[PDB]
Scaffold this motif. Structure first.
Motif, PDB file in Angstrom:
ATOM      1  N   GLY A 170       0.807  -1.197   0.000  1.00  0.00           N
ATOM      2  CA  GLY A 170       0.000   0.000   0.000  1.00  0.00           C
ATOM      3  C   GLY A 170       0.844   1.252   0.000  1.00  0.00           C
ATOM      4  N   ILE A 197      -9.804  -1.007  -4.362  1.00  0.00           N
ATOM      5  CA  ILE A 197      -9.910  -0.209  -5.580  1.00  0.00           C
ATOM      6  C   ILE A 197     -11.271   0.474  -5.595  1.00  0.00           C
ATOM      7  N   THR A 198     -11.249   1.809  -5.486  1.00  0.00           N
ATOM      8  CA  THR A 198     -12.441   2.627  -5.583  1.00  0.00           C
ATOM      9  C   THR A 198     -13.082   2.548  -6.963  1.00  0.00           C
ATOM     10  N   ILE A 442     -11.616   8.410   6.341  1.00  0.00           N
ATOM     11  CA  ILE A 442     -10.762   7.824   5.315  1.00  0.00           C
ATOM     12  C   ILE A 442      -9.816   8.835   4.667  1.00  0.00           C
ATOM     13  N   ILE A 452       2.918   9.522   5.092  1.00  0.00           N
ATOM     14  CA  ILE A 452       3.503   9.596   3.761  1.00  0.00           C
ATOM     15  C   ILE A 452       3.460  11.024   3.239  1.00  0.00           C
ATOM     16  N   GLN A 455       6.236  13.024   4.931  1.00  0.00           N
ATOM     17  CA  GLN A 455       7.541  12.664   4.407  1.00  0.00           C
ATOM     18  C   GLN A 455       7.779  13.232   3.012  1.00  0.00           C
TER      19      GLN A 455
ATOM     20  N   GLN B 419      -5.291   5.001  12.551  1.00  0.00           N
ATOM     21  CA  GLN B 419      -4.234   5.301  11.571  1.00  0.00           C
ATOM     22  C   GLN B 419      -3.151   4.224  11.511  1.00  0.00           C
ATOM     23  N   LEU B 421      -3.392   1.169  11.479  1.00  0.00           N
ATOM     24  CA  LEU B 421      -3.802   0.076  10.616  1.00  0.00           C
ATOM     25  C   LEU B 421      -3.781   0.448   9.143  1.00  0.00           C
TER      26      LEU B 421
HETATM   27  C1  LIG Z   1     -11.649   3.745   1.141  1.00  0.00           C
HETATM   28  C2  LIG Z   1     -10.356   3.408   0.442  1.00  0.00           C
HETATM   29  C3  LIG Z   1     -10.279   3.505  -0.942  1.00  0.00           C
HETATM   30  C4  LIG Z   1      -9.090   3.224  -1.610  1.00  0.00           C
HETATM   31  N1  LIG Z   1      -9.073   3.306  -2.987  1.00  0.00           N
HETATM   32  C5  LIG Z   1      -7.961   3.027  -3.597  1.00  0.00           C
HETATM   33  C6  LIG Z   1      -7.954   3.065  -5.049  1.00  0.00           C
HETATM   34  O1  LIG Z   1      -8.905   3.369  -5.780  1.00  0.00           O
HETATM   35  N2  LIG Z   1      -6.727   2.737  -5.594  1.00  0.00           N
HETATM   36  C7  LIG Z   1      -5.606   2.317  -4.892  1.00  0.00           C
HETATM   37  O2  LIG Z   1      -4.583   2.018  -5.504  1.00  0.00           O
HETATM   38  N3  LIG Z   1      -5.624   2.305  -3.535  1.00  0.00           N
HETATM   39  C8  LIG Z   1      -6.740   2.624  -2.935  1.00  0.00           C
HETATM   40  N4  LIG Z   1      -6.767   2.562  -1.585  1.00  0.00           N
HETATM   41  C9  LIG Z   1      -5.559   2.131  -0.888  1.00  0.00           C
HETATM   42  C10 LIG Z   1      -5.022   3.169   0.091  1.00  0.00           C
HETATM   43  O3  LIG Z   1      -4.332   4.159  -0.670  1.00  0.00           O
HETATM   44  C11 LIG Z   1      -4.031   2.500   1.039  1.00  0.00           C
HETATM   45  O4  LIG Z   1      -4.741   1.865   2.095  1.00  0.00           O
HETATM   46  C12 LIG Z   1      -3.064   3.478   1.706  1.00  0.00           C
HETATM   47  O5  LIG Z   1      -2.064   3.927   0.791  1.00  0.00           O
HETATM   48  C13 LIG Z   1      -2.414   2.916   2.957  1.00  0.00           C
HETATM   49  O6  LIG Z   1      -1.827   1.627   2.658  1.00  0.00           O
HETATM   50  P1  LIG Z   1      -2.093   0.377   3.580  1.00  0.00           P
HETATM   51  O7  LIG Z   1      -3.599   0.252   3.813  1.00  0.00           O
HETATM   52  O8  LIG Z   1      -1.424  -0.834   3.057  1.00  0.00           O
HETATM   53  O9  LIG Z   1      -1.449   0.779   4.954  1.00  0.00           O
HETATM   54  P2  LIG Z   1       0.078   0.557   5.322  1.00  0.00           P
HETATM   55  O10 LIG Z   1       0.950   1.040   4.204  1.00  0.00           O
HETATM   56  O11 LIG Z   1       0.250  -0.889   5.795  1.00  0.00           O
HETATM   57  O12 LIG Z   1       0.291   1.547   6.543  1.00  0.00           O
HETATM   58  C14 LIG Z   1      -0.049   1.165   7.896  1.00  0.00           C
HETATM   59  C15 LIG Z   1       0.574   2.166   8.824  1.00  0.00           C
HETATM   60  O13 LIG Z   1       2.001   2.195   8.578  1.00  0.00           O
HETATM   61  C16 LIG Z   1       2.397   3.517   8.311  1.00  0.00           C
HETATM   62  N5  LIG Z   1       3.537   3.471   7.417  1.00  0.00           N
HETATM   63  C17 LIG Z   1       3.695   2.676   6.311  1.00  0.00           C
HETATM   64  N6  LIG Z   1       4.820   2.872   5.675  1.00  0.00           N
HETATM   65  C18 LIG Z   1       5.454   3.869   6.420  1.00  0.00           C
HETATM   66  C19 LIG Z   1       6.674   4.519   6.260  1.00  0.00           C
HETATM   67  N7  LIG Z   1       7.530   4.273   5.259  1.00  0.00           N
HETATM   68  N8  LIG Z   1       6.990   5.482   7.163  1.00  0.00           N
HETATM   69  C20 LIG Z   1       6.127   5.754   8.145  1.00  0.00           C
HETATM   70  N9  LIG Z   1       4.936   5.205   8.382  1.00  0.00           N
HETATM   71  C21 LIG Z   1       4.655   4.244   7.480  1.00  0.00           C
HETATM   72  C22 LIG Z   1       1.162   4.217   7.743  1.00  0.00           C
HETATM   73  O14 LIG Z   1       1.252   5.622   7.944  1.00  0.00           O
HETATM   74  C23 LIG Z   1       0.065   3.591   8.600  1.00  0.00           C
HETATM   75  O15 LIG Z   1      -0.018   4.320   9.815  1.00  0.00           O
HETATM   76  C24 LIG Z   1      -7.956   2.840  -0.873  1.00  0.00           C
HETATM   77  C25 LIG Z   1      -8.031   2.746   0.506  1.00  0.00           C
HETATM   78  C26 LIG Z   1      -9.218   3.028   1.172  1.00  0.00           C
HETATM   79  C27 LIG Z   1      -9.235   2.951   2.672  1.00  0.00           C
END
Ligand SMILES: Cc1cc2nc3c(=O)[nH]c(=O)nc-3n(C[C@H](O)[C@H](O)[C@H](O)COP(=O)(O)OP(=O)(O)OC[C@H]3O[C@@H](n4cnc5c(N)ncnc54)[C@H](O)[C@@H]3O)c2cc1C
Ligand SMILES: Cc1cc2nc3c(=O)[nH]c(=O)nc-3n(C[C@H](O)[C@H](O)[C@H](O)COP(=O)(O)OP(=O)(O)OC[C@H]3O[C@@H](n4cnc5c(N)ncnc54)[C@H](O)[C@@H]3O)c2cc1C
Lengths: 607, 607
Positions: A170, A197-198, A442, A452, A455, B419, B421
């Motif tokens: 993600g 994916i939205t 969200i 992110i 950063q 957040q 998660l």
């Molecule tokens: C309602 C909804 C719609 C979405 N629609 C789309 C869409 O259309 N297309 C698409 O591609 N994606 C989509 N997403 C994906 C969304 O962009 C990701 O959930 C988001 O980028 C966070 O990734 P993750 O859920 O894997 O969380 P993670 O990356 O696992 O993050 C979990 C925690 O770790 C932290 N973290 C992670 N890496 C770091 C780092 N390097 N430094 C510091 N902290 C860090 C984060 O801040 C967070 O607190 C959607 C998500 C939601 C909730």
């Protein structure tokens, strides 16, 4: 009326009285759009938002979409589909779209003001409607042949998706493992499972959907640099006529159950897993994936920030309207007297504190995103800021994580004050604020988490930028400070600016010291979000004080009536923000100046 | 299995920090030693994590259904089964007086026990509050009423507190529900009440005792004219307890809420359906608001403990997730796209977030247990050396902290739990989003945060002549004055203590100025909630620091393994809180010193 309460008055004030966007209207690229038409456009979409768009806001939440495993499709509630038809029938999915795709040309600042109303009234409606705008990005990145397909997609109003996230990828986009396999005919077969994916399916809203899919060609290197972007349509189609042909192998397999934004279908999307290939076309027939995709990401980050700000605005106005009518208690000057007249709760200091907090952050945030938008057009930026194209782009890129991260975080926090204003009734679904809160949670997560954003802001938008964009913005604040009724505000802004420069310098030191002591970089991480939030507070304070300066000029010139009340509130909000929000940046600077790595050295087991 | 308990931290507080074991096995607590106390905690923690938590989701997804024709509620089966587990174990009789069937125990232990129910399924505790309210009725009742209260407690009758009307929430004294005295000495109650928790509860119990505030005919206005009445759902034999004819008190609606959905929140009509609502004057004296505040004080204690319990399992969920979620490279290797992927506990911002959740969750746990140690005269004497009168005043001072600071802090920091998660935090599949929804109301019922802050300043400080506040400040000064491994923390606490003393002086000065210019009192109201939150931060940081001092002694003495890790975490928490939370109170003091009435004089139309 609806749940949605719009503020065209504040938008126009920002666009015209503060930033001067009317000064490009009526001439050259905008030659056929004048100041009157622009304002009529905003009034028109505001009425559409408050009417047919907002009408299905509750319904989408109470009667959410349903996944059908028997057809791998999604069903949407009828009331919401009716709202979507209102949006398309008025042509609203095509404003700010390029002219060759059927669009009405306009400044980005006007475009985002128009979109605010859709995001305030029913934000998923805009997300389902983002298809033509993504067709345009596909056009600008596509080969000449691909430009014809994108033209068909825009003209027919196909939906679209941005397909990056996977279960294990993600925030770390470059860890993705969806694979691309080149075929003898030059097309590609995409194979993978993407998550969250939205709009990956949209019931019968549109005749086709364009998925823009990140995937790793076989043999490519690791990380984001190894990724490519693919045009993957839901249905195959005739490349000249647009006629819809057979189904392509890209299928929704689930829809998530979420806290809010329920009517936006958030789907697991399988590519090439159901026995037919997901055929894709390399965008631009070049391997340049993350770069191409970030044109989309930048737009999505602007949209999420503007969404959060739109939601707080209508949250505030709902809270204000409620407070004006709710009788409860005596005036505090009569608190001991139990025969004293009961008053409306706007008479109570904590409520006015709450309302002014909501007002200043809503209006401050609106100013931030419209200001960010005045740097998204080279010609507007020249005309209203005197900056050339290169600086404008860097200033826009600097401000985007503020709109997104500061906007998302601030809107959700201040909606708490909105709900508080209703008392126990705020906890009821009868009122819209609890849904505002769930729908907006969200915004701190998708299109990149606040961390992110923080950063990107520091590492990429400041350090990599060599501070040029930040030095420009800070210099505009400094000029305002150097310039009577606004002397206290300017003194407080001076302190806030120095505080932010101090924080920037402390973090820069932590980063530069990492060459000789790697773990020093952790202090950057520990501080990044608080630093982003501080710059947001600084910008809000500056722009509100700028608004107050215009308001003073307008009152001095004789404003009366409803205009005079509006100008009076700008003065009040700017002063309140300077005296109640900005000083806390001093303690925050001192905290950032003393960050240490104790919390990084602690055993995980001690948490 | 959403619920994650922390018995270890509870025992650490109860025994190693506050020494509640000193009174265990002596005088009133002769049959409860420290071992039994520890087993009671482990036992209800196990029950909470199993059967009670089992229906947490079910109650949200399958909320009660109202039959308007019968005026009853149907509760979901899984949740009624959790209620039966609670009853079968005797947990609706925690800390109940021995003569009612209770096990005598310090209030600190009782609230620790209840914490597990509130974390696991808070509405289950709310439904189970009948016996505790029976005891309050007992204590306020005539000799004959004491017999009805004994029956109600033994038979496990449910109970309600019935105050709120559509036009009287915060302003209780504006209630219009009427009481009409009958020749035999009973009363007929007439009126419509609103937002009544557990006004019906299916077949959980054989009766409900409604404790109802109503105004005798011809009584004066305000709270002083109100009386308190025993209004049973069913008439019953006053000698045997046998249930008789339905009394004239009927639920006429059940609200649709953002959260806490399994708690039936009801409109309650008395004497509107052609059947009298017979009520009996509590203690056969007219003293309603005083009597009802015995109930409000428990409810405010419960709401605070609820918010705290929910943040704790919020955090423990977030921590468990962070420990196993891999995303991104370590920050010392950001540049390297080949670097190993790490679990997110490695990232500075996530560690910042987790430590913020941990410090506030554990600081709040210490606050409510601290508060409880002043709730028994014998525990206050043995543990603190204070007589019963100072003890009651200190407990009275801390309750708006528990409630107002507890509720606002827990909800805010749950945002960090969610957040952690990432996008999964937004899913119902994980419990955090329901924690947020369920806990939003904690800032509202049992008196809004602004009413908490007003109570804190005017009644628990000013009307108290500062004595309780002076006691707590003196204890804080003692800790600061007394190894120098905590010198920096003590210096930060010294600045914070003076900041809070500064705030109290400013607000007191505004009040005094109000003798000359009534409007100056508005400044108290403008600052009251920030002062309440300041005192909460001060107490959190002080109690965390005391915990750190204990942990240091225990590490010095040779703690190993899991004990060692626990104690290290307390040191890191106290240090992080002092360096990252407490300094902001300096800016807050300076903001309070410059409050002004501009926002009060502003025309309402300018908002
Ligand atoms: C309602 C909804 C719609 C979405 N629609 C789309 C869409 O259309 N297309 C698409 O591609 N994606 C989509 N997403 C994906 C969304 O962009 C990701 O959930 C988001 O980028 C966070 O990734 P993750 O859920 O894997 O969380 P993670 O990356 O696992 O993050 C979990 C925690 O770790 C932290 N973290 C992670 N890496 C770091 C780092 N390097 N430094 C510091 N902290 C860090 C984060 O801040 C967070 O607190 C959607 C998500 C939601 C909730
Ligand atoms: C789920 C739920 C369950 C409940 N259960 C019960 C129950 O079992 N029994 C019961 O008796 N009540 C119950 N209540 C009522 C609850 O205690 C009231 O909602 C609460 O006291 C606030 O009153 P209100 O809703 O009328 O808001 P209002 O009193 O109308 O207040 C609205 C706003 O005005 C502000 N305000 C009002 N007066 C003042 C003042 N003097 N100074 C400053 N600001 C002020 C408030 O802080 C708030 O921001 C319940 C409420 C809920 C949400």
């Amino acid at each position: 009326m609806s749940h949605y309460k719009s503020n065209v008055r504040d938008q126009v004030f920002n666009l015209f009285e503060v930033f001067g966007v009317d000064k490009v209207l009526g001439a050259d690229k905008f030659s056929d759009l004048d100041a009157d038409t622009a304002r009529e456009m905003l009034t028109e979409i505001a009425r559409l938002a408050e009417g047919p768009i907002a009408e299905s806001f509750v319904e989408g939440d109470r009667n959410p979409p349903v996944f059908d495993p028997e057809t791998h499709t999604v069903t949407l509630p009828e009331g919401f589909k009716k709202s979507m038809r209102a949006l398309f029938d008025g042509g609203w999915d095509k404003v700010g779209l390029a002219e060759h795709l059927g669009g009405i040309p306009m400044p980005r600042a006007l475009q985002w003001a128009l979109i605010e109303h859709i995001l305030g009234a029913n934000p998923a409606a805009y997300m389902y409607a983002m298809g033509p705008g993504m067709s345009e990005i596909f056009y600008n990145n596509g080969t000449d042949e691909q430009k014809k397909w994108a033209t068909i997609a825009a003209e027919r109003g196909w939906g679209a998706t941005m397909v990056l996230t996977e279960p294990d990828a993600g925030s770390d986009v470059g860890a993705g493992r969806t694979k691309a396999v080149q075929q003898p005919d030059g097309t590609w077969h995409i194979e993978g499972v993407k998550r969250f994916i939205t709009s990956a399916d949209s019931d019968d809203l549109f005749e086709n959907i364009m998925h823009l899919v990140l995937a790793r060609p076989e043999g490519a290197g690791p990380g984001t640099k190894g990724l490519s972007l693919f045009f993957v349509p839901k249905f195959h189609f005739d490349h000249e006529t647009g006629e819809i042909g057979e189904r392509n192998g890209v299928f929704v397999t689930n829809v998530e159950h979420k806290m809010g934004l329920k009517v936006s279908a958030t789907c697991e999307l399988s590519l090439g897993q159901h026995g037919i290939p997901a055929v894709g076309w390399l965008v631009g027939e070049v391997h340049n994936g993350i770069a191409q995709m970030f044109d989309v990401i930048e737009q999505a980050r602007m949209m999420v920030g503007t969404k959060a700000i739109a939601t707080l605005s209508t949250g505030y106005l709902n809270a204000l309207e409620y407070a004006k009518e709710r009788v409860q208690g005596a005036d505090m000057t009569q608190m001991t007297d139990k025969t004293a007249p009961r008053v409306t709760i706007t008479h109570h200091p904590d409520v006015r504190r709450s309302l002014m907090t909501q007002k200043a952050y809503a209006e401050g945030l609106r100013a931030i995103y419209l200001y960010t938008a005045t740097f998204q057009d080279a010609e507007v930026a020249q005309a209203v800021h005197g900056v050339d194209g290169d600086l404008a782009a860097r200033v826009n890129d600097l401000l985007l994580p503020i709109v997104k991260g500061f906007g998302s975080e601030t809107a959700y926090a201040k909606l708490t004050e909105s709900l508080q204003t209703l008392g126990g009734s705020g906890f009821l679904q009868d009122y819209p604020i609890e849904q505002y809160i769930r729908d907006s949670k969200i915004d701190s997560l998708y299109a990149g988490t606040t961390a992110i954003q923080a950063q990107d802001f520091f590492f990429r938008k400041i350090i990599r930028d060599k501070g040029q964009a930040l030095a420009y913005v800070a210099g505009e604040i400094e000029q305002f400070i150097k310039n009577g009724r606004l002397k206290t505000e300017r003194e407080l802004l001076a302190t806030a600016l120095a505080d932010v420069q101090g924080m920037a310098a402390s973090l820069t030191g932590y980063l530069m010291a990492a060459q000789e002591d790697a773990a020093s970089i952790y202090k950057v991480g520990l501080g990044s979000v608080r630093f982003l939030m501080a710059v947001g507070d600084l910008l809000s304070g500056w722009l509100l004080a700028r608004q107050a300066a215009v308001a003073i000029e307008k009152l001095d010139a004789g404003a009366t009536g409803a205009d005079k009340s509006f100008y009076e509130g700008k003065i009040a909000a700017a002063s309140f923000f300077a005296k109640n929000m900005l000083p806390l940046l001093t303690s925050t600077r001192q905290i950032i100046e003393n960050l240490d790595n104790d919390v990084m050295e602690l055993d995980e087991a001690a948490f």
